[PDB]
Amino acid sequence: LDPKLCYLLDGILFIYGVILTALFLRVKF
Amino acid sequence: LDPKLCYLLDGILFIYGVILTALFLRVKF
Amino acid sequence: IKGNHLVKVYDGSVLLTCDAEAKNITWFKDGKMIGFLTEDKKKWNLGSNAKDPRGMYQCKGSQNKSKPLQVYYRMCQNCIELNAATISGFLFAEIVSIFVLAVGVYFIAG
Amino acid sequence: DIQMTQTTSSLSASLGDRVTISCRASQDIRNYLNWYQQKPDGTVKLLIYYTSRLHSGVPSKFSGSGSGTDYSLTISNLEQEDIATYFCQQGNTLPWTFAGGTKL
Amino acid sequence: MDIQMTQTTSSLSASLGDRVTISCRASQDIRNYLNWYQQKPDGTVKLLIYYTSRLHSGVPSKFSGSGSGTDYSLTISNLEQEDIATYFCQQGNTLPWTFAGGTKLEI
Amino acid sequence: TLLLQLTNTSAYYMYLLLLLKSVVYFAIITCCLLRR
Amino acid sequence: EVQLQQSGPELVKPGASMKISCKASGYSFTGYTMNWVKQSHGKNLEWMGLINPYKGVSTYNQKFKDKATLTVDKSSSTAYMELLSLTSEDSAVYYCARSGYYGDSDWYFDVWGQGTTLTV
Amino acid sequence: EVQLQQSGPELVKPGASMKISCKASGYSFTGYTMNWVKQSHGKNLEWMGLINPYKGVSTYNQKFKDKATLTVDKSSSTAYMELLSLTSEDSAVYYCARSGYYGDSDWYFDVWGQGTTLTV
Amino acid sequence: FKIPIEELEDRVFVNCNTSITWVEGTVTRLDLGKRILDPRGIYRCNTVQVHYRMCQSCVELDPATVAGIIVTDVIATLLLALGVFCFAG
Amino acid sequence: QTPYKVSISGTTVILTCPQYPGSEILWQHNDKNIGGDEDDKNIGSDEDHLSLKEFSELEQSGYYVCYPRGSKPEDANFYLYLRARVCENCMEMDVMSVATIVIVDICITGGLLLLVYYWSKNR
Amino acid sequence: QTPYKVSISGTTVILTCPQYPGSEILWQHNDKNIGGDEDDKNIGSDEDHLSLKEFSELEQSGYYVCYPRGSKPEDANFYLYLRARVCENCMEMDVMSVATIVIVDICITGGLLLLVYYWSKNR
Amino acid sequence: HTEKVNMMSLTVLGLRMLFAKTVAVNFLLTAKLFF
Ligand SMILES: CC(C)CCC[C@@H](C)[C@H]1CC[C@H]2[C@@H]3CC=C4C[C@@H](O)CC[C@]4(C)[C@H]3CC[C@]12C
Incomplete structure (x- = not known):
């Protein structure tokens, strides 16, 4: 069982990606 | 196939996060 | 039972019985003395089936030594699948990882 | 602690007679009673248990009967070794309360 | 190494309606592995008892046998004009499966 | 549930291979940092 | 043959502590619960209590919790009673009574002892 | 029904090579072993060997290992014996006998052929 | 009396001679759902305290691997701290 | 009871x-x-x-x-x-416990990185 | 035997x-x-x-x-x-094959990183 | 069976957590080497 731990670490990396995306869009302007 | 597509999503999240934070640290040179 | 065929096989662990007197059963393995057990438990266990128990087992009781029963388990628990999706994902991860490390070392010369 | 008194405290029994030993309890004990043979020199042994069963080594002349409160022992062909006292022992509730018994 | 399997009696004298036995002694213990073939005068043979305990499919029930170890025998009664034959035994343990000399009935 | 185990033990070696590559990349970046 | 042997008269001063052993032979001592029954006044039996031999745990009559304490010696295969504050009333005969270990056979006493007449 | 017909009696000269067939009918021929048995002098039966129709692997008698050769044409449901280097000792009846395929039932010859009086 | 537990079609349901009177725990014949959801509770038929641990969220963690990943995660975070130690030093 | x-x-x-x-x-x-x-x-x-x-x-x-x-x-x-299918050195944990331990690990990782960063800022 | x-x-x-x-x-x-x-x-x-x-x-x-x-x-x-388990194209990754795969990939990674370092330093 | 499949899933997740940590440490070391 447990195939959703992968989605948990993918959510962690997606949080990392979006908090870099917000910073990149902020400092890009 | 669900864990395998989850690992594909993991790989593209790694590459997207790495490239985006490489650009974001390119800004702060 | 017929002609010294005493060692039989019956729950992840493998249950390995012997057909002898229920006083003292000695379990040999690989042509040497490996075990010697007491009464009321003639179902000597080597491990779970996932830990691939294999080799020649033979018991010795009141009668003559039993002829060897060679268990051969290949319950894998370590077998990867060589399907097109898995080998394609491995090749993708290999090429991407070596390329990312190459970008890491291309930008190091200064 | 249910009091266990016999209706017949003392009786006269002839040799070679079939005499019952009446035992009674204050409450119903669900047939949980044993009878005990105490030779007057001091040595005592289990005669029967659960009012119906028979111990190993006990002679077949001893057997009990009764349900509820009034319990009896059946003893046939009394011998000189059979001349002793007998105790009905309640084995229902703590503590196990014995009885006064009857001499023979 | 082959089992020299022989029969004690080669020509047996009998009569119609008689119950008579046929002996066949083995050189070694062959653990209840025998057969009982009969040979017609024209040469046509067939199996009657196999494993010495069970009967062949389609055999008459008058054929029977027993024995174990090295001494084995056939039990046959009510001999007819159809039952006059020569009776054989064979071993089953070790290759080759060796026959015997055969016991021929006499009327 | 067998194919899920096959994917899991393929990933357990894929990510361990990625770990070996990242360890040797850590070795070369440590060598160049000592050079730095 | 299962045998239960005790001590002799065991002359003990009044008001002191008295010991009465009960040796177990012919069987495994820890496998069978040994009760303790006292012959009161030479005519009436009553139950003092029992002791588990395998674990040492004892259960007493509620009247006679303070009369004696039951201990066992697994090495010696003997059961002990330690009478506390014995009086002239408490001078009696004490039987050690084996029984079955579990709750289906701990209520009938299969083999008894000779009984030690604790006289003063 | 199941019945096996063989070739006719052939007056084969000594030193030549003979070929006797035996058809198999009424049953699946490739699933039952064919045993070849020689009746020497009209009295003593001798077992020469068996040929498995399916695999083609044949096990012979130790005496008749070289004096006999068994072949099977599975398409025509036949069993052949190429007797080689014939002698006047080989002037005997040569049955072919069906046993079972497997070791629990290949030791009894269920049905037998007519018999080729291979006269030398 | 000796109130039984029935495991039929991978499901647990209590069967009595009279009505079941539940008092506490997870809820003639009273169903409890499947046995894989691990039912517990006291069911007094006018009594059993049932318990199930047919573990399906069950992990066989060996100490070697879970110790290795911990002792390498700790050193990985230590080297990450060494990486952030070079942020301003 | x-x-x-x-x-x-x-x-x-x-x-x-x-x-x-x-x-x-x-x-x-x-x-x-x-x-x-x-x-x-x-x-x-x-x-x-x-x-x-x-x-x-x-x-x-x-x-x-x-x-x-x-x-x-x-x-x-x-x-x-x-009924209890026991198992050697074998805990039982849901997805929420694994989520808890990964959240604790990432939180103490961040809390140690900030601590090391501040102790490097001081000296 | x-x-x-x-x-x-x-x-x-x-x-x-x-x-x-x-x-x-x-x-x-x-x-x-x-x-x-x-x-x-x-x-x-x-x-x-x-x-x-x-x-x-x-x-x-x-x-x-x-x-x-x-x-x-x-x-x-x-x-x-x-008693064995089967697949469509499963291979048993025993310790020898896993160690060989790891050592081949680590030698491949070392050689590729050395070559990439060489031509990156050259340009 | 499943009690080992779940442990395999947890050790894959632990290896991936440690992979994210080692990617982070390689990224930070390379960036500070360039700085
Ligand atoms: C993840 C590990 C395995 C490999 C790391 C590779 C990537 C992430 C590294 C390698 C070289 C790095 C770059 C090297 C040089 C520059 C230009 C400078 O103005 C700012 C940072 C920037 C843009 C770096 C960002 C991150 C970078 C692209």
Whole structure:
């Protein structure tokens, strides 16, 4: 069982990606 | 196939996060 | 039972019985003395089936030594699948990882 | 602690007679009673248990009967070794309360 | 190494309606592995008892046998004009499966 | 549930291979940092 | 043959502590619960209590919790009673009574002892 | 029904090579072993060997290992014996006998052929 | 009396001679759902305290691997701290 | 009327009988006497803790009832039914516990990185 | 008494019986005879092998014994109990193959990083 | 069976957590080497 731990670490990396995306869009302007 | 597509999503999240934070640290040179 | 065929096989662990007197059963393995057990438990266990128990087992009781029963388990628990999706994902991860490390070392010369 | 008194405290029994030993309890004990043979020199042994069963080594002349409160022992062909006292022992509730018994 | 399997009696004298036995002694213990073939005068043979305990499919029930170890025998009664034959035994343990000399009935 | 185990033990070696590559990349970046 | 042997008269001063052993032979001592029954006044039996031999745990009559304490010696295969504050009333005969270990056979006493007449 | 017909009696000269067939009918021929048995002098039966129709692997008698050769044409449901280097000792009846395929039932010859009086 | 537990079609349901009177725990014949959801509770038929641990969220963690990943995660975070130690030093 | 706390721990089951305080408590499995001195030493009824070393899901399982010393097994009307597929060095955890441990790990990673960053800022 | 060497690849198992040389070798399975003409053409046979193509999980798993032609099934000198798992293209990643894969990939990574370092320094 | 499949899933997740940590440490070391 447990195939959703992968989605948990993918959510962690997606949080990392979006908090870099917000910073990149902020400092890009 | 669900864990395998989850690992594909993991790989593209790694590459997207790495490239985006490489650009974001390119800004702060 | 017929002609010294005493060692039989019956729950992840493998249950390995012997057909002898229920006083003292000695379990040999690989042509040497490996075990010697007491009464009321003639179902000597080597491990779970996932830990691939294999080799020649033979018991010795009141009668003559039993002829060897060679268990051969290949319950894998370590077998990867060589399907097109898995080998394609491995090749993708290999090429991407070596390329990312190459970008890491291309930008190091200064 | 249910009091266990016999209706017949003392009786006269002839040799070679079939005499019952009446035992009674204050409450119903669900047939949980044993009878005990105490030779007057001091040595005592289990005669029967659960009012119906028979111990190993006990002679077949001893057997009990009764349900509820009034319990009896059946003893046939009394011998000189059979001349002793007998105790009905309640084995229902703590503590196990014995009885006064009857001499023979 | 082959089992020299022989029969004690080669020509047996009998009569119609008689119950008579046929002996066949083995050189070694062959653990209840025998057969009982009969040979017609024209040469046509067939199996009657196999494993010495069970009967062949389609055999008459008058054929029977027993024995174990090295001494084995056939039990046959009510001999007819159809039952006059020569009776054989064979071993089953070790290759080759060796026959015997055969016991021929006499009327 | 067998194919899920096959994917899991393929990933357990894929990510361990990625770990070996990242360890040797850590070795070369440590060598160049000592050079730095 | 299962045998239960005790001590002799065991002359003990009044008001002191008295010991009465009960040796177990012919069987495994820890496998069978040994009760303790006292012959009161030479005519009436009553139950003092029992002791588990395998674990040492004892259960007493509620009247006679303070009369004696039951201990066992697994090495010696003997059961002990330690009478506390014995009086002239408490001078009696004490039987050690084996029984079955579990709750289906701990209520009938299969083999008894000779009984030690604790006289003063 | 199941019945096996063989070739006719052939007056084969000594030193030549003979070929006797035996058809198999009424049953699946490739699933039952064919045993070849020689009746020497009209009295003593001798077992020469068996040929498995399916695999083609044949096990012979130790005496008749070289004096006999068994072949099977599975398409025509036949069993052949190429007797080689014939002698006047080989002037005997040569049955072919069906046993079972497997070791629990290949030791009894269920049905037998007519018999080729291979006269030398 | 000796109130039984029935495991039929991978499901647990209590069967009595009279009505079941539940008092506490997870809820003639009273169903409890499947046995894989691990039912517990006291069911007094006018009594059993049932318990199930047919573990399906069950992990066989060996100490070697879970110790290795911990002792390498700790050193990985230590080297990450060494990486952030070079942020301003 | 407390329930029997079943303490599964690896390949070991610990049943408890806290219903009767102080009294010596015996155990019975499927109306067969167990606990204390038996054929197998894998089971020991120490105090109220009926330890079951190397628990088998088929032969050491089923009905369990505790009764105090001086009380009949047939007197008790409060049984337990045990089924427990035990397993060697084998915890049981849901997805929420794994989420908890990964959240704790990433939080202490960040809290140690900030601490090291500030101790590097100071010196 | 040479052990029955077994070569499993994919979903087919090839049971070799290294003893009984030269003679015809038959086979037996759960005290039932296979290795010849039967209803299923999946379970083949050979001069030394019993190739169970499309090997089932449990429908074809049991006691597999070879015996020579003439010898009885219980007269065989050896037994084997086979219970294996099959796939479509599974390979057993044992410690030798895993170590070889790891050392090949680490040498590949070292060589590629050295070459990339060389041509990055050159430009 | 499943009790080992779940442990395999947890050790894959632990290896991936440690992979994210080692990617982070390689990224930070390379960036500070360039700085
Ligand atoms: C993840 C590990 C395995 C490999 C790391 C590779 C990537 C992430 C590294 C390698 C070289 C790095 C770059 C090197 C040089 C520059 C230009 C400078 O103005 C700012 C940072 C920037 C843009 C770096 C960002 C991150 C970077 C692209």
